Every structure is written in C-alpha cells, then in structure tokens.
Amino acid sequence: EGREDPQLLVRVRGGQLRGIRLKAPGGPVSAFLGIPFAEPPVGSRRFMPPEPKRPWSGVLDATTFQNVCYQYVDTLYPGFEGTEMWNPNRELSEDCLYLNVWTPYPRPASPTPVLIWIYGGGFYSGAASLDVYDGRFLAQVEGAVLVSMNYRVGTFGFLALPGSREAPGNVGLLDQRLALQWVQENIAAFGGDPMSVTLFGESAGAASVGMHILSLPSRSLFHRAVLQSGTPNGPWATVSAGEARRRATLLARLVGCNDTELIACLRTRPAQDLVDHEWHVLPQESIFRFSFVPVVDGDFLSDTPEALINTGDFQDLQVLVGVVKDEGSYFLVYGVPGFSKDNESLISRAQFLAGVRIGVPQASDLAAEAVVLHYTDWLHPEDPTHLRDAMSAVVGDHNVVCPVAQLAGRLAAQGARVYAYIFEHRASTLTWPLWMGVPHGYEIEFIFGLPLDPSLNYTTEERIFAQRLMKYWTNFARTGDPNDPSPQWPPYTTAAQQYVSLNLKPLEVRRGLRAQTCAFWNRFLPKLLSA
Ligand SMILES: *[C@@H]1O[C@H](CO)[C@@H](O)[C@H](O)[C@H]1NC(C)=O
Ligand SMILES: *[C@@H]1O[C@H](CO)[C@@H](O)[C@H](O)[C@H]1NC(C)=O
C-alpha cells in the first residue's frame, strides 16, 4: 500500500486483503484467491466442525489459489485431459479451507447479486481452483460477484461415528455453511449483495446445494439455488447413520485403529493412509457410489432427504435444476467390464447383466431382473450397441435423471418455482469418444463461459451458446427467472412437467423428464426392494 493498485485492497472481518487484476477476454476483473474462512482443520481438529478463522495482522496476499483439500487422485487414464482437468491443481493439504472471490474491475458501485459455486467430485474429490470453475467470465461479462470455497472431502470431510462428539459427520457440509456465513458478513465489501445469494453446484456440489435447502440453519444464508446433475435425494448422496458407522469403523481397522479412542487413533494417521484405504469400505462392487458422504445424522439432516423433500414447505424458493444428455457414460469406463474410452465398448448381454449388478449394487436378484427387463430392447435383446447405450441409461437414470425428476416434482408440488433443463451439446473440444455422448460434468465449462477464451479453441457458435447460458444463469440469480424480460422457458410443474433443451438451437420446450422410466425407479423399484 502506497504504490499498489488502490482498486485491489479490501478489508474483511478477519483483516486486510490484497487481490489481483486478471485479464478476461473483454476486460479486467478483480480476483481475491485463497482467503481463509476457517482455522486449519488439522491435528486435533481433523473430523471436527470447522472453526471460524481468527483475524490476522497485516495485508493477507490473496493473489493465488490455496491448497486443495487432501484427496484421492484419479489415475485411470494418465495425462489424458478428459481425466486431468478434474485433478488437484495445487498442493494437497488438510490445511485447505479457503475461498475465492471474483468481481468486476473496478468493483461494482452498487450491490451485485452473488453466485456461490460448490464443486462436485463424489464428496471424495474436487477443488474450487480448477480451470473449469474460473469465475473471470461471469464476473467480466455478466457483472457477477462469484464465490467458490474449498470444503473437506473423503474421510476428512465425511467420516462419521454418528453421535460422537469428535466425528459427528457432515463436517464438509459445515465447511460449506461457514463459507456461506462468510459471504453474508463480508461480500458487501467487494460490492456483493448479501441479500441476493444464489447457490450453484454440480453433481455432489448439486447434492450439497440440495442439503442446504433442506437444512434450516443454511436457509437464511441464500435465496435461490441451482442443482446441476445432482440431488440430495437418490441412492448415492447420503448414507444412514448405521452405514456411516460401519464404514468409519472398517476404515479404522484397515489403518490399524469406544468412539473417543477409535477417533483419536484415526487422528494420528497420515492423511495419505486414510486416502489409501477409503475406497475399500464400500459394501458392494459399484459405480456411482462413494465411501464417505453426508450422513443422515438427525442434526444437519433431521431426516432422510426423501422424507424432507416430501414434507417440506418450499414456498419462498426458486430453483433451477437439470441434467446432461448422457449422465451415465462417464461412469461406465471406470468400473464396468467391457467399457473403455479407447474403443466403441460394444458389449454382450452377459456384460450388460453384470453391469446392471454393478450399477445397481443395492439390488436384490428380482430387482435387477426388473431393471434388465425394462432396459432390454426385446426386438434385439443381444444387440451390442443397444446394450451399451442401455447400460449408460441405467446408470444415468438411476443416479441422476430420475432423482432430479423426483426433486423437481416434489419441490413444485410444494410451492417452489422450478425451472428444468436437459443440456445436449457436446463440446467440439471433447476428448472422450463419441459413444459417450454428452457426458456428466461437460456442461460446466459452458455455464462458466470458457468458450469466450479464444485460446481454448471452441467454435464461434459455442461462444454464443456459452453467452446464452451465462445469461440464463445470471438472470436466474438476479430475479429467480432465467428468462430475459426469444422462446420462453416455462416453469416446471407437476401437471405439465415442462423443461427445455439447452443446445446450439433456440430453446425448445419438452414435457416429461423420462416420465415412464422414472416411474419405474421412483415409484416401483422401492416397493420391489422390499422384497
Ligand atoms: C474395449 O476395451 C476394453 C478394455 O480394454 C475391452 O474389455 C473391451 O472388450 C473392448 N471392446 C471390444 C468389443 O473389443
Ligand atoms: C488450439 O489450436 C492451436 C492450433 O493448432 C494449437 O496450437 C493449440 O495447442 C490449441 N489449444 C488447445 C487447448 O486445443
């Protein structure tokens, strides 16, 4: 301070910050990266609810991203951009509770609507610093204030001995909640409007947004929510207290460890030892299942998300939810034999039956038969191309498309204003093979407006498409309505079940989100599982 850029010095509750001026394609933006919002949850604080960060002295340098929360690093396809883009891009550390703010430059002179991003990655990975979550474009082009926070994942964020004091569960969700409290207190300092805060996230980040909707103390911290390909209901986003306890104690055993004693022993283990064993505690060979996720603790979650969306009053809530065209394909190449990014993955009937048992790992024999019966093409029951695509649909429908359907429906029936979409454009720059279609996670780079960066090699149409999506999302944040006061985007309702297609063509309205197949998963499967 003296010779420094006066536009980049800001004070928050904990002290003084110095940000950085970044170049976006249409002009500069302000970034404040690596702002601590919690005491490092290390040592005796592992597994504990986060504690608000204590004020610092001097000017904290906020010009670079901070550490990524310790996590498993995916190694299926080494050096291949398809997997690498999701991997940690800063040092892994338990000291990782930091958040990031982008704003116009100079800062808005009047209060601007805030978007808060929560990343996905199965509650076992992810980071707010990845290139695909870069807020410079939304800030520069839409004038948004954008916030994203790291939160603890894996065991560090989600290992629970329900009822204990030392490992109560859900602390990754409480990391997110603390960041939201930080926004309420401090965002006015950056030109943000704490009275207009829209949450958005994808996959597990979406489930997270969902859980904030369903958890009362989070409710006063935001006004609107966007759930991209993820929901708090469904088969992967939560586990019961019993199951959480069973996994935590199996994991303790695997690393050589009365809850207080078990937990103290876990606290002496190297971070990397926990990461090395976390995946071993799943009860069946699975895909789209994760070891350490939110637990129904009767605390953060007072009941299952199913019970809470069923009985909730959602009157003052606006919500944007949707899915990509091919939610399942991405997951098949990891753990279903016969699938691969490097060939067409034309599978046999035998491999379809086997993949159904992996895709629906909780299924009894009869339930699995029902799944196979429903997805088999009975004019061509052995055709490898249909079996390959049907396998994808099983996984995408069970895990994402049908839970989203159930969510939109319950939320509307109960007074929320809902807008639904299906995203159907495949990036021209996609490195996954064609058969995977428009895979899970590949809408994000358009919502954040990466196609605006000329060096990324997107097409001109893709550039205009990204601009449209950015408008929808920020209109929504701003007013609860994606429409600009072009074809209209009607609200989703139980009666008409309308949603739109997001692609290069103008909005097209459709009805029924896999209505027929989703009745199978949402109404019939549960009844069949008992017995
Ligand atoms: C594609 O590759 C996978 C793994 O290498 C293999 O199991 C599968 O059989 C291959 N597909 C065909 C039909 O060759
Ligand atoms: C974009 O295209 C140019 C020209 O071939 C190439 O040199 C550059 O590496 C490309 N960047 C990406 C990420 O595709």
Residue numbers in the entry: 1 to 257, 265 to 492, 497 to 542
Give verbatim lines from the article.
Acetylcholinesterase (AChE) terminates cholinergic transmission by rapidly hydrolyzing the neurotransmitter acetylcholine, and it is an essential enzyme for humans and other species. The catalytic triad in this enzyme consists of Ser203, His447 and Glu334 located at the bottom of a ∼20-Å-deep active-site gorge, where the residue numbers are based on the sequence numbering of mouse AChE (mAChE) that is used throughout this paper. Organophosphates or organophosphonates (OPs), used as insecticides and nerve agents, irreversibly inhibit AChE by phosphonylating the catalytic serine residue. One key step of current treatment of OP intoxication is to use oximes as nucleophiles to reactivate AChE by removing the phosphorous conjugate.
Knowing the aging half-life of sarin of ∼3 hours for hAChE and the half-life of ∼4.6 minutes for sarin in the presence of HI-6, we found that 30-minute exposure to 2 mM of sarin followed by one-minute exposure to HI-6 led to a good-quality electron density map that unequivocally defines a nonaged sarin and most of the HI-6 structure. Gratifyingly, the final electron density map from the 1-minute dataset is of good quality and clearly defines the sarin conjugate including its isopropoxy chain. In the HI-6•sarinnonaged-mAChE structure, the carboxyamino-pyridinium ring of HI-6 is sandwiched by cation-pi interactions from side chains of Tyr124 and Trp286. The side chain of Trp286 undergoes a large conformational change relative to the apo mAChE. The electron density for the side chain of Asp74 is disordered and thus modelled in two conformations: one is similar to that found in the apo mAChE structure, and the other, which is dominant, point with its carboxyl oxygen toward the central linker of HI-6. The oxime-pyridinium ring of HI-6 enters the catalytic site and forms cation-pi interactions with side chains of Tyr124, Tyr337, Phe338, and Tyr341. These observations suggest that the oxime-pyridinium ring is rather mobile (adopting multiple conformations) in the active-site gorge.
